Design an enzyme around this catalytic site. Structure first.
Site, short mmCIF file in Angstrom:
data_model
loop_
_atom_site.label_atom_id
_atom_site.label_comp_id
_atom_site.label_asym_id
_atom_site.label_seq_id
_atom_site.Cartn_x
_atom_site.Cartn_y
_atom_site.Cartn_z
N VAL A 244 3.68 -0.80 4.57
CA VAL A 244 2.44 -1.23 5.10
C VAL A 244 1.69 -2.03 3.84
O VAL A 244 1.85 -1.42 2.74
CB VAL A 244 1.45 -0.06 5.21
CG1 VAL A 244 0.04 -0.22 5.82
CG2 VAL A 244 2.13 0.88 6.47
N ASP B 96 0.20 15.02 12.17
CA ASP B 96 0.19 14.89 10.58
C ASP B 96 -1.06 14.62 9.85
O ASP B 96 -1.22 13.76 9.02
CB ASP B 96 1.44 13.59 10.49
CG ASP B 96 2.17 13.84 8.85
OD1 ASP B 96 1.65 14.92 8.26
OD2 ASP B 96 2.98 13.27 8.80
N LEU C 181 0.54 -1.23 -0.08
CA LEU C 181 0.07 0.18 -0.05
C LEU C 181 1.02 1.31 0.18
O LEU C 181 0.37 2.41 -0.74
CB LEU C 181 -1.15 0.08 1.19
CG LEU C 181 -1.96 -1.12 1.33
CD1 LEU C 181 -2.73 -1.05 2.64
CD2 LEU C 181 -2.83 -1.54 0.21
N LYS D 175 1.60 -3.42 8.96
CA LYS D 175 2.58 -2.53 9.16
C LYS D 175 3.86 -2.85 9.53
O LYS D 175 3.88 -3.27 10.74
CB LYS D 175 2.08 -1.09 9.95
CG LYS D 175 3.11 -0.16 9.97
CD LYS D 175 2.55 0.98 11.08
CE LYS D 175 3.23 2.28 11.33
NZ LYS D 175 3.01 3.27 10.48
#
Ligand SMILES: COc1cc2c(cc1Nc1ncc(C(N)=O)c(Nc3ccccc3)n1)CN(C)CC2
Ligand SMILES: COc1cc2c(cc1Nc1ncc(C(N)=O)c(Nc3ccccc3)n1)CN(C)CC2
EC number: 2.7.11.1
Lengths: 289, 287
Positions: free
Chosen positions: A26, A132, A18, A41
């Protein structure tokens, strides 16, 4: 926290990458028996890392349970690689979506903002900071629901931490106040509210403000005395409530800037008819242009 | 900033060292025969020439005995060259690695000259940000000069590395951007770093040099953090112990200025002069 000391390849089949960076990778992954799709992950573990702090960080992920935060299922530690099994969000990020669909409608943005604020108000009640908030870190499942992807685990361990130390340089001559800022930075909880303001513009316009301007120049301008917070470009396209949402979220002073709880009582995000159906329309636009 | 070739002014002799800050060469003047230090800095394509001009004007105007002298600047073939005063004995690090530990009087002289340098820099609203043995330079006369690498931080490879480190700023709040640029450095952090440097010169290493840097950063930020001290008590005088105590005040509000520190017993005593360092350079030449 039960961190399983076993290979996750026995339990999951890795399908598709991904994304990733310095922290690690991930993957989209399928459960072998149960058939659940998950997000796996991979986090690269450097040899001189405290296992006790890793345990406390996975305990922080285990305890952090909320509808708008991506769910933690379990952990594997195997061959100096931490694997974190998480909830899969089948439509990817809002960035992945808007790059195909074009700009979101006001009601779509209003729904997204409500769900992110719900996520943020939870994180801030736990004394955490997301750090973030952006289109690329707000994930969408096939049901049209909104999840925050949390990259905070990589900050305390591994290659992302090792890269932070390399950039900061040798700390032995550094004063306590300088060390404090090297770890923490300028991040407080109310910086997530600013970032959501920028995100709402991003979803509205396909870019954050000043995206074509050089990053150092943007950083200098932000730090000036008379810095004007950014705005929506077209005034007539958006309602007064959406303009006001941007105005209050982009309050320059952190002391005067409203909290996530405060923002949830704002007109834009407290209006009726904000539900996942709005995002199901977006995903239909993505599939059938 | 002269648009001439610096090859017309200088011949590059020998590479002195290098890093992210840039490459630095020993160079000879073509007419006068004077030796200089030429700092090469590689120019990235999206560097503001106007800001570079404003930074070099600050370097030109900042004149003091204990700061390395600026001679000129040359821009040629996407490489900024900064011509500076040569310090023929290198850094104090280069010296102590051969000579062993400095004596108390030698350290006291070094500290006086650094503080004279810092009091000047702080009066100009600047921060050195990097006081350590490797950045305190010694000329053949036994005089003490501070090397300033701050000019390279705002352009070239050091700028490109800073931008990669901070990441994209477009979602970042003003207070977060402020701290990304400033980085916690205030003027009184140079006083702490000098305290650590004094221990470094005394013991060949800063405190906690064998401890992992992240662990040191965590320990420094705790509530009950104890500032370091000199290891051996009896070797050093009460005035030197006190110097370390006051320079390593944890609270920035309580920590004394460079001007205040220049009136301290250790650095205000008589018999502190360049002779102390000329003895050190003689020890370097004949152990
Ligand atoms: C079909 O699902 C996707 C597609 C695409 C992405 C993401 C997903 N889903 C997805 N779900 C859940 C998670 C999670 N628990 O954190 C996640 N994390 C992630 C992925 C990558 C990087 C960094 C984090 N990702 C990313 N885009 C950059 C390209 C396409
Ligand atoms: C015989 O002169 C030396 C020898 C050695 C050095 C330095 C000098 N002189 C020297 N004078 C002045 C400067 C200056 N204008 O800033 C300078 N810059 C510099 C600082 C740090 C590093 C490399 C270069 N260097 C460095 N040592 C690490 C190895 C040997």
């Amino acid at each position: 926290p039960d961190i399983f000391n076993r290979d996750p390849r026995d339990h999951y089949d890795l399908l598709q990458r991904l994304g990733g960076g310095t922290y690690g990778e991930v993957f989209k992954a399928r459960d072998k028996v149960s058939g659940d799709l998950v997000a796996l992950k991979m986090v690269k573990m450097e040899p001189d890392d405290d296992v006790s702090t890793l345990q406390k960080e996975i305990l922080i992920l285990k305890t952090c349970r909320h509808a708008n935060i991506v769910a933690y299922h379990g952990s594997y530690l195997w061959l100096q690689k931490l694997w974190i099994c998480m909830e899969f969000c089948g439509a990817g990020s809002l960035q992945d979506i808007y790059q195909v669909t074009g700009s979101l409608s006001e009601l779509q943005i209003s729904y997204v903002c409500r769900e992110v604020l719900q996520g943020l108000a939870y994180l801030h009640s736990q004394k955490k900071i997301h750090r973030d908030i952006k289109g690329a870190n707000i994930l969408i499942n096939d049901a049209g629901e909104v999840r925050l992807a949390d990259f905070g685990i990589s900050a305390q361990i591994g290659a992302e931490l090792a890269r932070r130390l390399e950039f900061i340089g040798t700390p032995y001559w550094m004063a306590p106040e300088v060390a404090a800022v090297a770890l923490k930075g300028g991040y407080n909880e109310l910086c997530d509210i600013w970032s959501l303001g920028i995100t709402a513009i991003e979803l509205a316009e396909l870019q954050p403000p000043l995206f074509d301007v050089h990053p150092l120049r943007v950083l200098f301008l932000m730090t000036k005395s008379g810095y004007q917070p950014p705005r929506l470009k077209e005034k007539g396209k958006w309602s007064a409530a959406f303009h006001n949402f941007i105005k209050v979220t982009l309050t320059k002073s952190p002391k005067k800037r409203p909290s996530a709880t405060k923002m949830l009582s704002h007109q834009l995000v407290s209006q009726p008819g904000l539900n996942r159906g709005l995002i199901l329309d977006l995903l239909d636009k993505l599939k059938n242009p």
